[PDB]
Design a protein around this ligand. Structure first.
Ligand SMILES: [Mg+2]
Ligand SMILES: [Mg+2]
Ligand SMILES: [Mg+2]
Ligand SMILES: [Mg+2]
Ligand SMILES: [Mg+2]
Ligand SMILES: [Mg+2]
Lengths: 161, 24, 169, 25
């Protein structure tokens, strides 16, 4: 009883909280991104908790990848014109050898890092565009279906250890 | 390799580490 | 370049940018001094925008030239929205029904702008009733409806949103 | 009266057609 369109709507809400809590973590480990510091979130919800929890439990792993992803984004030099094209290529390659919850979370992580990188280089007002990259890639390339088949994003609250 | 290829590789590596650690 | 070649996905990405500036500059012009109006929506007052661009100008210009018309509809839309009682649960369904009915007799530039106006009013209404963090959801409603109901193609076939900069008196 | 979702669409179309008459050349 979980549609792919419902999963897509939930993905927007999950990603907003993911971005907020991930940035809050990074800034307590570089100048803050005020678009993330003040990002409006829906009132406390299960989907908001999904985003927060996935940012928190991935914190140690994400920190170990900081230098690698920040450097590769500097090499990639994404712009407003080509960001979606690169995002699609990268996300396609991420899931071509399989889908699992960790790789789903990695796509959220890349969305966060891409959004932060372009902001740091002067591209304001783009967080909605990147959120759309994440939501639409998952919806249009059957990742939303993969999530729905597991009961939707709420299933991610069982990730832990 | 091109930066986008290396990014995808490291996302797979990161994701599979996350999965091994947190997917029961 | 020639008319007909622009993709619907290009129009969709542009629609998100147009709608943000439409929302920002519409909300800005509607504010009043001395506390005589409803409280501002801080999500709109501080909405981040891309660096000054043609798509940003489209959103701004459509808000500005529609100001007089929009204000004449304020009281009736406030009444109709209170009656509709949109929530986080039903906003998608209601948006789709309303937008479908809007365009049932055809597409024209004025009705496209009316859809932007409805997105603005729906987003403001739910915020005023306590639904924070929902402006991106409404933006997705607008973008996705246009993409799936021929509006994005209609705009693309006319050269994209830049064609709206010829709207005026 | 009619359901609010119906009335809203009618008034959006009315408004849209006023805008079109005024600004679309
Ligand atoms: Mg641009
Ligand atoms: Mg201007
Ligand atoms: Mg609600
Ligand atoms: Mg909800
Ligand atoms: Mg027309
Ligand atoms: Mg366009």
């Amino acid at each position: 009883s979980m549609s792919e369109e419902q999963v897509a709507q939930d993905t927007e809400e999950v990603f907003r909280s993911y971005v907020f809590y991930r940035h809050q973590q990074e800034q307590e480990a570089a100048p803050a991104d005020p678009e993330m510091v003040t990002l409006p979130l829906q009132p406390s919800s299960t989907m908001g908790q999904v985003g927060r929890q996935l940012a928190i439990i991935g914190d140690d792993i994400n920190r170990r990848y900081d230098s690698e992803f920040q450097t590769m984004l500097q090499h990639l030099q994404p712009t407003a014109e080509n960001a979606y094209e690169y995002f699609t290529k990268i996300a396609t390659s991420l899931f071509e050898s399989g889908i699992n919850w960790g790789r789903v979370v990695a796509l959220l992580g890349f969305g966060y890092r891409l959004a932060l990188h372009v902001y740091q280089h002067g591209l304001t007002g783009f967080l909605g565009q990147v959120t759309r990259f994440v939501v639409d890639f998952m919806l249009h390339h059957s990742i939303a279906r993969w999530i729905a088949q597991r009961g939707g994003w709420v299933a991610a609250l069982n990730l832990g250890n | 390799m091109r930066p986008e290829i290396r990014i995808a590789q490291e996302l797979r590596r990161x994701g599979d580490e996350f999965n091994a650690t947190y997917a029961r």
